[PDB]
Amino acid sequence: NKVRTVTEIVNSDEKIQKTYELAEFDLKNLSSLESYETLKIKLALSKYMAMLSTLEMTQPLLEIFRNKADTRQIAAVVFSTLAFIHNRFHPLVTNFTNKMEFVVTETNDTSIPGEPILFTENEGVLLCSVDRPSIVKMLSREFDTEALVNNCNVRIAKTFGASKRKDFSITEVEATQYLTLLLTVEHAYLHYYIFKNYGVFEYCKSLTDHSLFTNKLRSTMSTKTSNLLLSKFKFTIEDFDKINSN
């Protein structure tokens, strides 16, 4: 809210009182935090793009996922993303230990809605199932590069305080594609983490209801690991209450 300060000389009683409104410092703090988080997320995204480049695949991401024949590259990209997320949670880890299998489904009767990437052991080693058609559909869905997204007082204050500044094939569309892939693989990684550390039955229960994620993860994630990418924003379904009533 507000505070005030009083200046006074030791030998004198003439005191000068000033008042401060903390809203200004609140704006400073909020702007600093927003900038810091934006920088962190952009750094992570750039790092992801850079390692994918390091793999040195000729085609762009969407073309790669469209090329059904080259399962090799799909598996490479998926594993690299999964390992990147794993390290982002455990920076000291740079490999994945146990070897990994991969399969690329091609039909609805082979895919599971809501979990394009999933895991299942063959009783000896873990296999990652990929819904390449779903990946292609997501990355191909037309994106909005125009509309903006969003207290009016602090909004205006930020508008008037913060400033603005007026050879890569990447547009905002490709950045969005990369972010979507990262988020999907992050969701899959959370499922896999719950699996590995709580058993296949717990993994199935999580698939049924993600809410268990709360405890099964926050026990370790919020404390020791970098926050989830989604943590950058609070997400919600438009007209959620009426939709639920429906």
Binding site: R66, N67, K68, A69, V136
Partner: protein, 353 residues
């Protein structure tokens, strides 16, 4: 652009060096020859290559750097009956004329002289130089080729340099003179132009237009052409893909390699197609002696017929239809187990199948 008939222009590669012998006094209305000669040159340094002693016909000889006189309209230049006026490789409009006919000698043929009525074109047997783009070269001050004349006629690896403030027209004239010297070289000479690629491309375009003007004036065709930078890059890529060392293979020979295919397979080599496309951005057709048909980028065409047959010549509806196209594409996708990157197109046909 208009020119006064009083000017007579002679174009010859030889004019890279001034033709002292060809100069002759002009006569006035009274048929009195003028013993005063005025020689105009594009740059001051050029004066040093004009030997006044080589003008016995005249009694006084003066040399000056021709400069655009903004106060005189070239459509009607001032006349000076007191002297015979000769211009050597002019780069700016002639604002002054001499008694009788004002003589001009040039290795270049710019628009200014292009409309000139009297045009004498000297013909030469072509002799091409070698483009040797590469980062033991002999530097050459292009602004003053005659100074390096001995080296230009002896050595075969030249680094063409220019002063920073050299003008574009000066550059063009220097390059033309050097290329004439190479045209008279018995042995083709390799050269490298120490200039930005875009500047070199513009210079080549202007030289090509000059050669076109000479042809339109009746010059003999010369195979000693030049290649735009994009075309050179494409040729280099092709050579690298084939595993051909660039220094080992010359572009001309590289292209000639496919003449064995041109006629016998009656097909236009893709290299020639790409070069033609580059030039267009800056169609093909050919035949053989006694040949009844012409090979073109479009395929076989009856000689003298348009590049495309009448639209209704062939009916493609049977397969040139969405149903057939989709059927074939789906069959390909299924058989190859593909999901993208597949594209099938109906095949159209020109005059002949």
């Amino acid at each position: 652009m208009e020119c006064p008939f009083q000017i007579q222009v002679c174009i010859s590669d030889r004019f890279f060096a001034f033709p002292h012998n060809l100069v002759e006094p002009q006569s006035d209305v009274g048929n009195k020859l003028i013993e005063n000669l005025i020689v105009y040159v594009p740059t001051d340094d050029d004066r040093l290559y004009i030997d006044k002693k080589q003008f016995p016909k005249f009694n006084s000889v003066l040399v000056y750097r021709h400069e655009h006189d903004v106060n005189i309209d070239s459509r009607s230049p001032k006349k000076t009956a007191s002297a015979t006026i000769v211009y050597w490789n002019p780069l700016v409009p002639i604002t002054e004329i001499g008694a009788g006919e004002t003589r001009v000698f040039s290795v270049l043929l710019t628009n200014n002289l292009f409309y000139c009525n009297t045009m004498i074109v000297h013909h030469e047997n072509p002799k091409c130089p070698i483009e040797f783009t590469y980062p033991n070269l002999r530097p050459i001050a292009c602004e003053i080729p005659l100074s390096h004349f001995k080296e230009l006629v002896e050595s075969n690896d030249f680094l063409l340099c220019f002063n920073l403030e050299t003008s574009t027209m000066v550059k063009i004239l220097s390059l033309k003179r050097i290329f004439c010297i190479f045209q008279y070289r018995k042995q083709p000479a390799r050269y490298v132009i120490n200039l930005p690629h875009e500047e070199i491309d513009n210079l080549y375009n202007k030289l090509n237009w000059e050669r076109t003007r000479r042809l339109m004036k009746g010059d003999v065709p010369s195979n000693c052409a030049t290649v735009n930078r994009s075309s050179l890059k494409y040729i280099k890529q092709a050579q690298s893909l084939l595993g051909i060392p660039d220094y080992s293979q010359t572009v001309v020979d590289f292209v000639k390699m496919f003449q064995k295919i041109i006629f016998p397979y009656q097909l236009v080599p893709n290299v020639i197609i790409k070069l033609n496309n580059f030039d267009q951005m800056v169609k093909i057709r050919l035949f053989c002696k006694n040949d009844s048909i012409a090979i073109s980028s479009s395929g076989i065409v009856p000689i003298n017929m348009p590049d495309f047959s009448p639209p209704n010549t062939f009916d493609y509806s049977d397969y040139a239809n969405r149903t057939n196209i989709n059927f074939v594409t789906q069959r390909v996708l299924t058989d190859g187990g593909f999901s993208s990157g597949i594209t099938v197109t109906p095949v159209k046909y020109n005059y002949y199948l």
